[PDB]
């Protein structure tokens, strides 16, 4: 499945040939990979959960405590607050 | 608080007792809540 | 692909389906490639008939064995079909 | 050091000997640990 972004292997087939020019094939192995289609899936949803997460206040998305998802960190004067 | 950069809080801080207060120093207004002194500018050496 | 479905597809769709690897080099229908076009609404209704008027059989083999030797006037051919 | 939510640090720095210590320059209070000078504001040119 040749493309500029990525060429994936999608078809595998074992083929023999005869001395008279004939061909012997076996059922192929078909493969599929997951697709990316950002226009078809362009789904905006509100996030009311990030209450007051402000680009211009002391806020950041960070992996405190080493979890695989960022929490919301807020840095106050004397305290940090955090929502994991 | 979850008080954004374009949001205000209306609050008055006051002293409910007898003390050597200056007139107008008995109460302070808090408007943004971030180390908020009720001054447009804070200067500890302005003579006041 | 039956000859009749082919003849209908041959002017236009055969080429679209062939490039999409729905129709294989020897005229077979690729399982995942057709399904992807059915799911994607790219499939042509003309190949639907080939999933219904041409039922599939499990991959199989056939053995033909004579009971008697070549010169005999009574060579019966024993037939057996094996499906896996 | 590490601190809790809104804890401060209480420490007094003082000179234990004979010297020209001005009245109130004898000792310094520390409220926090961030290169904490003895004042609310450090000014090297306020005449003091």
Automatic annotation (TrEMBL), chain A:
Compartmental location: Secreted
Protein name: TcdB2
Record organism: Photorhabdus luminescens
Parent sequence residues shown: 338 to 421 of 1474
Automatic annotation (TrEMBL), chains B, D:
Domain of life: Bacteria
Protein's UniProt name: TcdA1
